[PDB]
């Protein structure tokens, strides 16, 4: 390494792995962490939470108009009542897609995403391409995902710059007549609750 240019040399991913183990070991040795505390967290975020929670919310809104209206009038109260509340989901707002309004959510500054409702964010949601571009050329970005909106549909991008979090309520597609709530929930994709896709008729 030429010492004029230390900044051209990134830490290898082996470094971060090593550092992760060192912090885990020191914290356990000093009584600040435990094997089971680490595992409880991992279990919660890799297995317990996920986009099925939001899918259930969406299916309920589609099947129960009084619930949908309550959810849109005061989502934080409603979502808390259902139990979808917790770390990084203390204040969750629901934004409704309509025929002429399409909502797309981003964390330009990092990765902010409502874990208690939707689980962990997509890989791409956290990476610079989506974060940089969606606020400026959302139509181009949406086309990459296969959503090509007409010029007359307004796009609202929601940048998660505070602890307030946003979930998109996508519209129920055609072709779903007489499906049950449970059946409707299985159609709700994670990507639809971010706003990068509409829901396909089944």
């Amino acid at each position: 390494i030429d010492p004029r240019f230390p900044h051209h040399h990134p830490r290898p991913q082996s470094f971060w792995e090593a550092r992760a183990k060192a912090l885990e070991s020191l914290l356990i040795e000093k009584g600040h962490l435990s094997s089971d505390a680490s595992e409880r967290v991992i279990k919660h975020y890799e297995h317990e939470l996920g986009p099925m929670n939001g899918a259930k919310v969406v299916a309920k809104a589609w099947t129960d108009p009084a619930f949908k209206q309550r959810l849109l009038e005061d989502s934080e109260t409603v979502l808390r009542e259902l139990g979808y509340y917790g770390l990084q989901g203390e204040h969750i707002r629901v934004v409704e897609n309509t025929d002429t309004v399409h909502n797309v959510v981003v964390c330009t500054l990092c990765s902010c995403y409502p874990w208690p409702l939707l689980g962990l964010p997509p890989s791409w949601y956290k990476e610079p391409a989506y974060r940089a571009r969606v606020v400026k050329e959302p139509r181009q970005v949406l086309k990459e995902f296969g959503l090509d909106l007409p010029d007359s549909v307004e796009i609202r991008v929601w940048d998660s710059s505070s602890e307030i979090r946003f979930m998109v309520l996508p519209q129920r597609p055609e072709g779903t007549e007489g499906m049950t709530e449970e059946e409707l929930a299985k159609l709700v994709t994670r990507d639809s609750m971010i706003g990068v896709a509409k829901i396909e008729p089944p």
Partner: protein, 227 residues
């Protein structure tokens, strides 16, 4: 801070690497799982970080070359390290020595320890969360529908005021309440809560692009002025 993290409106990052959701796996390496346990585990006990503000600034302080190459949970390891050392929970040399140990012998075993009471404690953060909503005695400066001009300020410490939204006209969409103020809390200076607003900005104003796009951004009161 006007750093590499603040990417909104940048060009050159390329196409979005779409993956179907069922194929978009959460973790590929055990150290990534460890990172999650480390952040939640420390924050649940107020160690190095009482909430997310301190967590975020440690990521924003990364070498830009590291921020872009570490991978996502690399950022989490970077901030855990940063904040534990900064608050005196961990000694920097002790942590560097031990990193080197695991670097050279990546099969070194991590000590085991069972602490159910700590598990309970961590469960509390998971389910109770860390709402930043506070009450203050002051009244909001701004009201819904008001047209404001965001400031041209350049904090060298943490801020949640993205550069693309600076010195821009917008319209107050909602008055949330007073929230812990990140620019202070990130640097351990007090919650000092300030009114938080949702603000709508038109594409034409942000980019000079006449088209049917808008961005809604949550901004603290001090980021803005009346017109």
């Amino acid at each position: 801070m006007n750093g590499i993290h603040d990417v909104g409106g940048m060009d050159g990052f390329g196409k979005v690497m779409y993956v179907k959701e069922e194929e978009d796996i959460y973790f590929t390496h055990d150290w990534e799982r460890l990172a999650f346990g480390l952040v939640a585990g420390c924050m649940a006990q107020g160690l190095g970080m009482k909430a997310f503000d301190e967590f975020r600034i440690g990521i924003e302080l990364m070498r830009p070359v590291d921020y872009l190459t570490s991978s996502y949970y690399g950022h989490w390891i970077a901030t855990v390290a940063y904040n534990l050392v900064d608050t005196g929970v961990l000694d920097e040399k002790e942590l560097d020595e031990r990193t080197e140990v695991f670097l050279k012998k990546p099969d070194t075993k991590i000590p085991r320890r069972e602490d159910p009471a700590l598990v309970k404690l961590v469960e509390k953060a998971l389910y109770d969360g860390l709402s930043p909503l506070r009450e203050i005695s002051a009244s909001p400066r701004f009201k819904v529908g008001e047209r404001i001009k965001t400031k041209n300020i350049h904090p060298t410490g943490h801020t949640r005021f993205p550069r693309y939204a600076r010195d821009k006209y917008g319209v107050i969409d909602e008055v949330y309440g007073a929230h812990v103020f990140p620019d202070d809390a990130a640097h351990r200076k007090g919650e000092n809560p300030q009114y938080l607003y949702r603000v709508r900005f038109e594409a034409e104003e942000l980019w000079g692009y006449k088209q049917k796009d808008s961005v809604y951004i949550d901004l603290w009161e001090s980021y803005m002025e009346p017109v």
